[model samples]
Target: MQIFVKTLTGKTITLEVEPSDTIENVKAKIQDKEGIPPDQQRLIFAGKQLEDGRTLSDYNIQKESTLHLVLRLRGG
Candidate 1:
């Protein structure tokens, strides 16, 4: 399955992985693609935390599905 990934910082990356991959896996993939860590990757989906005890199955991420990466953070 291919996941259409997007970033809140205006960066986008797509990755192909197994359907059984979890949200944690996707988070790691995003970190790898953006050179960011889990702590720094505060993503939001459906107005909730991206990896907040949720799995791809919970979100119904299908094969060749697209997912947005909304980087949430506070800065000076």
Candidate 2:
């Protein structure tokens, strides 16, 4: 399946993945493409946060669906 991911900086990247792929896998790809590490990536779809343990199909994500990518900010 292919999905569109829009980052906070307004960059859209197309990702090809399996429905059985975990969110962590998606994050890894995003990290590779966007340079945001997995621990710093936050993915949102359908108004809910995606969990690393969950598969795309588990979240009912379909082909060509749009997902939002946010870089997690940390402050001390």
Candidate 3:
């Protein structure tokens, strides 16, 4: 499956993932691609926040969806 992560600046990152991957895993991939840490990766889909524990399928995030990463926050 494919997940799209769009920055607030309009940069889009396309990720290849399995439906079983956790939101934390997605964030790790975002870290690999964008150099943003998982703790700082706030992914929003359908105007709802995705937590670390749930699967992509837990949210049933199917179809051509673009998960929005709205902030570039930095902290430990």
Candidate 4:
């Protein structure tokens, strides 16, 4: 299935999930398109923080919910 993951800036990316694909797999999909690493990604749905090991259905994610992605960076 395909879903939308829009950014803070007005850019929306398409994420296609294979039923129960893990959050990590989703991140890798985004990483491939955006050139970012997996560990630095954070996808937010409702009030729950997305876990690397879980899928969309693992939480209270709605069918119409759009993932909010944050590329949080930690620098020296």
**Top lDDT: which candidate number?**
2
Q: What is the C-alpha lDDT profile of model 2 across 1-76, one tens digit per residue?
A: 8999998778899989989999999999987876777888888998999999999998899999899988787733
Reference-based TM-score of each model: 0.68, 0.89, 0.86, 0.82
On the 0 to 100 scale, the lDDT of residue 48 in model 3 is 84
Candidate 3 TM-score over all chains jointly: 0.86
Question: If candidate 4 were superposed on the true structure by all CA atoms, what would the RMSD be?
Answer: 2.1
lDDT tens digits, residues 1-76, model 4?
7777877786889877764778899889999989888878889887678998898778655454588888878743
List residue ranges in candidate 3 displaced over 4 A. 72-76
Can you rank all candidates by lDDT, best first? 2, 3, 4, 1
- Model 3 gets an lDDT of 0.83
Q: What is the C-alpha RMSD of each candidate to the true structure, in Å?
A: 3.1, 1.6, 1.8, 2.1
* Ranking of candidates on TM-score, top first: 2, 3, 4, 1
Q: Write the per-residue lDDT of candidate 1 for residues 1-76, one digit (tens) a residue.
A: 7777767656668887665776777778877876776555554555556564667767666776667776546653
Candidates in order have lDDT scores of: 0.67, 0.89, 0.83, 0.79
Clashes of 4: 0
Which of the two, 2 or 4, has more TM-score? 2
Candidate 4 global lDDT: 0.79
Cα misplacement distance, residue 20 of candidate 1 (Å)? 2.6
